[PDB]
Design a protein around this ligand. Structure first.
Ligand SMILES: Nc1ncnc2c1ncn2[C@@H]1O[C@H](COP(=O)(O)OP(=O)(O)OP(=O)(O)O)[C@@H](O)[C@H]1O
Ligand SMILES: [Ca+2]
Ligand SMILES: [Ca+2]
Ligand SMILES: [Cl-]
Lengths: 139, 370
């Protein structure tokens, strides 16, 4: 139904455990996201840090998505023809961590979180291919 | 059956994944035919690679297509890879998946070109490109930590999180084994001997590798060398001159820590390492400190570990805990780590497919390999 079609789509192959379309302009809000997971809770403050002009404090400070503490690996969110930020969660004591890609479109952020062991390059390519589709449609 | 191909500036190391060691190590050189007219001379070919190019040095113009880790001429490289698959491993590359390595910070265009050649030219059925340092970290069986990699041309500090290199915090130092070799040369000349030529550089390189060491306290070892022959060693030249090295033994690697010995304004390897850590996420500084791993030829110096240990201790927050790891096999780390990664079932899930290429083309490398 509407944007939920995109989530359901991202999630179908079993390789991911969370996904989300988030409107970043004006008043940032989640458009669609997996229920009872992480990205569903993303705040507009968090969204402002992902897209704000400071591209370097979040290296040393880290950043949260939905209050989940994350570590940035590559930032090219604002770079033409790249459009991605790659992160990995941080956990306590041997508890698994997960790769995440956020891709920027004209109006949206597409977020995606792999299951344990899923490689960052696959999440990157999946997230980025979905974003493209959106971007092709003026989104 | 996957292939591992580690491309240094000087030696190409190729093998099969899961093997303990490369099944082929050969100089990374292309020779073309040098003035001599087609047939008589000997080289009728317009291309010659590696050891046969070495043995045929005369009547050939010898090139290294790799420089400081970065590919410099794509025409030559192509023949290294051509020769790697065909003459050295005796394989049909269209039949094997391959893991390539690349330098930290390998530029965009280069990553893309590496990808194009593998697919359009060798018709690789699948490929992946991995940061050399990252592979050295797996060879030591960790996934978090910072790699200090030092070869002959360049030194890099690469912090790594769960197997992901952190490019904003990678530092490059233009100071490796060559500058050391040249420095040793210089101080042996000053002492009384006379190494200045290309033939003599190789003698000195060999002295470096054979007798140099890092001193725990630099002032103190100087004072011990000044008051005793206890540290002097003798060395047997290609002719028959036997010579004596004292001071020089540990004054030479000392330039890794004090680059003003070479007229350089840089900080040394200890401080370059700390500066990388300080650029990482406060939450993993702890694990980098206790997982600092050395790799490459120039890290084989006895005492370099203890000294790194000591120098990091001083720079770091005082109740942090430091650990230098220096694999007894740390010369061959990069190809080993490669063999570890590319031999897993998992690997199928990371690589770039030939069809993925047909679909997305060369820029797929920026999405998939990191
Ligand atoms: N046991 C040793 N002690 C000190 N230095 C060594 C030792 N073994 C090798 N080296 C140095 O390492 C350098 C060459 O080895 P290495 O294969 O790491 O570099 P490369 O891959 O040929 O070139 P680059 O690293 O510039 O791409 C030389 O400077 C060599 O003298
Ligand atoms: Ca080499
Ligand atoms: Ca001379
Ligand atoms: Cl995109």
């Amino acid at each position: 139904a509407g944007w939920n079609a995109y989530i359901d789509n991202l999630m179908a192959d079993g390789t991911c455990q969370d996904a989300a379309i988030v409107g970043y302009k004006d008043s940032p809000s989640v458009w669609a996201a997996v229920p009872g997971k992480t990205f569903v809770n993303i705040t507009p403050a968090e969204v402002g840090i992902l897209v704000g002009k400071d591209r370097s404090s979040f290296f040393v400070n880290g950043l949260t998505l939905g209050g989940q503490k994350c570590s940035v690996i590559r930032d090219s969110l604002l770079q033409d023809g790249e459009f991605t930020m790659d992160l990995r969660t941080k956990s306590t004591g041997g508890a698994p961590t997960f790769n995440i890609t956020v891709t920027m479109t004209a109006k949206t952020l597409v977020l995606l979180m792999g299951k344990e062991g899923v490689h960052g390059g696959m999440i990157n390519k999946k997230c980025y291919e979905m974003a493209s589709h959106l971007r092709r449609s003026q989104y | 059956a996957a292939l591992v191909v580690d491309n240094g500036s000087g030696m190409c190391k190729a093998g099969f994944a899961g093997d303990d060691a490369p099944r082929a190590v050969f100089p990374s050189i292309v020779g073309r035919p040098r003035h001599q007219g087609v047939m008589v001379g000997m080289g009728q070919k317009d291309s010659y690679v590696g050891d046969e190019a070495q043995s045929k040095r005369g009547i050939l113009t010898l090139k290294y297509p790799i420089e400081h880790g970065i590919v410099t001429n794509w025409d030559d490289m192509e023949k290294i890879w051509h020769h790697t698959f065909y003459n050295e491993l005796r394989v049909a590359p269209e039949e094997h998946p391959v893991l390539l390595t690349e330098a930290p910070l390998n530029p965009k265009a280069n990553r893309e070109k590496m990808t194009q050649i593998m697919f359009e030219t060798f018709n690789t059925p699948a490929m992946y490109v991995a940061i050399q340092a990252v592979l050295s970290l797996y060879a030591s069986g960790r996934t978090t930590g910072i790699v200090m990699d030092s070869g002959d041309g360049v030194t890099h500090t690469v912090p790594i999180y769960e197997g992901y290199a952190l490019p904003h915090a990678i530092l490059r130092l233009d100071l490796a084994g060559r500058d050391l070799t040249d420095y040793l040369m210089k101080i042996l000349t000053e002492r009384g001997y006379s190494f200045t030529t290309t033939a003599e550089r190789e003698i000195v390189r060999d002295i470096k590798e054979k007798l140099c060491y890092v001193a725990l306290d630099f002032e103190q070892e100087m004072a011990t060398a000044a008051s005793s022959s206890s540290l002097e060693k003798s060395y047997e030249l290609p002719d028959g001159q036997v010579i004596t090295i004292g001071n020089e033994r540990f004054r030479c690697p000392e330039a890794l820590f004090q680059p003003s010995f070479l007229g350089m304004e840089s900080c040394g390897i200890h401080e370059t390492t700390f500066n990388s850590i300080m650029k990482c996420d406060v939450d993993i500084r702890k694990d980098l400190y206790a997982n600092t791993v050395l790799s490459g030829g120039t890290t084989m110096y006895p005492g370099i570990a203890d000294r790194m240990q000591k120098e990091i201790t001083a720079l770091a927050p005082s109740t942090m805990k430091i650990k230098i790891i220096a694999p007894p096999e740390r010369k061959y780390s990069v190809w080993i780590g490669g063999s570890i990664l590319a031999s897993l079932s998992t690997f199928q899930q990371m690589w770039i497919s030939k069809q993925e290429y047909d679909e997305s083309g060369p820029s797929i490398v920026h999405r998939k390999c990191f």
